[PDB]
Design a protein around this nucleic acid. Structure first.
Lengths: 232, 190, 179, 73
RNA sequence: GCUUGUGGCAGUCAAGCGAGCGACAUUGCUAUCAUACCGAAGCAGAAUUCGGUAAGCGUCUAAUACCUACUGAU
RNA sequence: AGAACUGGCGAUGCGGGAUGAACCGAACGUAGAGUUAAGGUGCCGGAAUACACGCUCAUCAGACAAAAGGUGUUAGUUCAUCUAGACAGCCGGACGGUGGCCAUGGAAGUCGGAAUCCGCUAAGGAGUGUGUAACAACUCACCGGCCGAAUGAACUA
């Protein structure tokens, strides 16, 4: 005994199990012989609305995603396991999120689409700040004063304890208004972003960093060749 | 189920060195030295390469094995404190009565004073444990920075400071006056 | 709820008296124990039957104790108008009472009260939450009518609260007869 | 005494700086405190604690079964 | 190997045992008084409610739950 | 409680049970040798602080109140997956009609009433919670990334 029990709540959704993994494994093989070309995207992170926009703008070329090991097994980790000649080459190359994008369009269309495409996203940890953001020397605002304070409503006091106890900033509450004793420079251009800094920026909604998905490897269903490109 | 042998590995950087014998433990480093007694824990130490220290328990049950992990945790905490150190940002707040904090050396012993809490005329003092240093934080109002090497001593001093000034027979939801630990960190900025 | 509490108390009294009058004819120790259990269980069931009224009484007690203690007989002044036209600031500056003046309509949801002295005469002022039916509107109307106090209507020549002067005039005319 | 001030006071000044930590630690210590009480509180208090724990467990089982039955449909 | 706090029972529940039974809920009319030290409660203060330790001391006031032993003296 | 049952007691010593009539042993003359029953082999008290397998930290353990609870402890049964990455831990995703339809002074997932669907994703509840007057903001349960092997749920001893 003495083992702590797992916390459980009666949610409305249940687990999927290995059934979904097996279904994806079968679907990868069933779609490999259909589309003319197959690609793997090194999309570290994509917002669900962004992914849906890409899919609808690219629905003609169906996108497949899943666990890295499952997709590599479906594609084959070696020649003896490849579903098609040279297919296993892209499986080894991929290291991050799979992003297995099947497409009927040639290399030129894919590379042009992935070069023209670009979207904004929050700056993640280990990156450098794309802008400078200093909080005022008084009441804080939802956007931190990057926009005119006449329209930037003050931050809701209910979130003050989180800032006080987690972000370490000298936040204090005065008559229900969050205030700081100095203009704390949370981040500056060229400064490496910490996890706390990234969370602070996300809270303020400063999505100044740009993001664009990149393709790692290419495969042809009729030429039996694989190519890799660094184009983002 | 009466494990034949269980052990944990302690990693020590080149910046610190330790010598191990009977459970009196010696630790040395740039910030000074620390000592601890574990003769009541009944565990065995073993060095392999002068940078990894093995702690193993033979024929020990789960209750006994639980001390094996805590010994390694304490050793790691001592090593970190000797190398980096621990700095605690202690903050006190008030609404009407300005809380007065002073440092005195009555009878040689160092003490931390608390006065004017909710208008109380009683004088409160807390002895400063060995290795703990006190200095007022800069550019921060009503902040006291406790610093020291030993984690246990500094943590106990901070707990005593924040717990002796209890709000007594008053509305806790309303009377926010008091002293609380605001942040825990290391002396070295890294 | 009050009648239910009284009836439960009366039933408990009657049951206790009857069981006292009944237990005197028991023979065995277990018979007396069973009769005592009978009385105790009847009392417990009567108490448990009041589970909802007990909670209602607790909730109403928790709120009644924080209601303002105003005196309708003494001289007083009432401030009324559309929800948070600015009268909230008027109360916040005419008395120590601290009330927000946020732009949204119902900045105040209760009859805030403050006291001040004029010519060494005690005076109390009550801040009406707002007038448009609703429980808050009915409470404001009752406070305006029953209280022996003058009513200070509030209007806005500017765009504060996003309401036109015509709406305020219409509301004043609609409520005019009773004040 | 005027109004719900305590809520207004909490909004304007907040709870204790360590209130969240105190509440979290108190909630986390209840797991061990329940065991300590089960291993203590002799006399009629033990009977009452055991009855309350049994009732709570029965209610939890009933809720879990009801959710499981309704989860399918 | 006595005693202590939730009125019997009609149906509904029915976890489990195994033909038939049966927990916990539910409709039916029906061993601290005060002082001392802590925790919770709409605990603003005062005052007060509940819960724990405590038998030290009290119980209009803070509250009014024929031989051995014996003190003494050779 | 109605009886039949065969034994002890009455008329019964002796050994053990700390001393007993309902228990165990036991065919009662005076002495010597040797072996036993129950009962014991830490001292009082004659005899191993004997061998060996495990169990217990218990603020009267130990020499009929009980049906259950304890994040006490040591063993097994039935369901779970698992090098397509076990459990846990750190990060990310956590959508679109939609601020679903009523309830209205203001509530959009979380103040209430009933529906609770398709479209899509490896994964999204017309929302399991925190919170705001209301949006916001954090979070699960659902997955993905990191990390490298047994773990998760109820039961029997």
């Amino acid at each position: 005994r003495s083992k702590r029990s797992k916390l459980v709540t009666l949610a409305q959704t249940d687990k999927k199990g290995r059934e979904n993994k097996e279904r994806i494994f079968d679907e990868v093989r069933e779609a490999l012989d259909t589309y003319r070309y197959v690609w793997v995207l090194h999309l570290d992170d994509v917002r669900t609305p962004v992914l849906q926009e890409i899919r609808t703008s690219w629905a003609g070329s169906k996108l497949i995603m899943g666990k890295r090991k499952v997709l590599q097994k479906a594609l084959g980790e070696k020649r003896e396991e490849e579903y098609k000649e040279n297919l296993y080459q892209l499986s080894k190359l991929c290291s991050g999120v799979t992003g297995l994008l099947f497409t009927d369009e040639d290399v030129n269309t894919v590379k042009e689409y992935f070069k023209s495409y670009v979207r904004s996203d929050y700056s993640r940890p280990n990156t450098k700040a794309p802008l400078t953001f200093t909080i005022p020397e008084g009441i804080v605002y939802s956007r931190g004063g990057q926009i005119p304070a006449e329209e930037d409503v003050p931050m809701i006091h209910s979130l003050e304890p989180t800032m006080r106890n987690k972000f370490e900033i000298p936040t204090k509450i005065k008559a229900g208004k969050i205030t700081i004793d100095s203009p704390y420079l949370v981040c500056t251009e060229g400064e490496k972003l910490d996890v706390r800094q990234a969370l602070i920026l996300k809270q303020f909604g400063i999505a100044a960093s740009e993001f664009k998905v990149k393709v790692s490897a290419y495969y042809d269903n009729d030429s039996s060749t694989v190519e890799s490109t660094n184009i983002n | 189920m009466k494990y034949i042998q269980t052990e944990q590995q302690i990693e020590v950087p080149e910046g610190v060195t330790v010598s191990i014998k009977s459970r009196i433990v010696k630790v040395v480093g740039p910030r000074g030295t620390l000592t601890k007694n574990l003769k009541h824990i009944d565990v065995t130490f073993t060095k392999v390469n002068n940078q990894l220290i093995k702690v193993a328990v033979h024929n020990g049950g789960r209750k006994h094995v639980a001390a094996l992990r805590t010994v390694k945790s304490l050793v790691d905490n001592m090593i970190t404190g000797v190398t980096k150190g621990y700095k605690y940002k202690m903050r006190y707040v008030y609404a009407h009565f300005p809380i007065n904090v002073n440092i005195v050396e009555k009878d040689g012993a160092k003490f931390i004073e608390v006065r004017n809490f909710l208008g109380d005329k009683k004088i409160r003092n807390v002895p400063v444990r060995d290795g703990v240093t006190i200095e007022f934080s800069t550019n921060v109002k009503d902040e006291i920075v406790l610093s020291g090497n030993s984690v246990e001593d500094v943590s106990q001093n901070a707990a005593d400071l924040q717990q002796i000034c209890r709000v007594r027979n008053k509305d806790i939801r309303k009377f926010l006056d008091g002293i609380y630990v605001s942040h825990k960190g290391f002396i070295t900025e890294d | 709820s009050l009648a239910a509490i009284s009836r439960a108390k009366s039933l408990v009294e009657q049951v206790a008296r009857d069981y006292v009058r009944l237990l005197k004819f028991g023979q065995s120790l277990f018979q007396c124990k069973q009769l005592k259990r009978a009385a105790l269980g009847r009392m417990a069931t009567i108490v448990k039957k009041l589970r909802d009224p007990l909670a209602y009484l607790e909730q109403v007690r928790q709120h009644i104790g924080r209601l303002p203690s105003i005196d309708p007989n003494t001289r007083t002044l009432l401030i009324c108008g559309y929800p948070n036209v600015g009268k909230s600031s008027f109360l916040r500056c005419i008395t120590k009472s601290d009330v927000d003046v946020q732009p949204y309509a119902f900045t105040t949801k209760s009859l805030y009260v403050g006291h001040f002295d004029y010519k060494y005469l005690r005076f109390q002022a009550i801040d009406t939450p707002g007038i448009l039916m609703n429980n808050i509107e009915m409470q404001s109307i009752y406070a305006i009518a029953h209280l022996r106090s003058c009513v200070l209507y509030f209007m806005d020549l500017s765009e504060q609260c996003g309401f036109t002067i015509e709406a305020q005039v219409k509301l004043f005319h609609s409520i005019k007869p009773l004040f | 005494p005027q109004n719900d001030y305590i809520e207004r006071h909490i909004k304007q000044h907040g709870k204790r700086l360590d209130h969240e930590e105190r509440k979290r630690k108190r909630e986390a210590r209840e797991s061990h405190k329940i065991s300590e009480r089960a291993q203590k509180l002799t006399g009629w208090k033990g009977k009452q604690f055991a009855k309350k724990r049994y009732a709570e467990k029965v209610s939890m089982r009933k809720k879990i079964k009801a959710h499981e039955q309704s989860k399918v449909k």
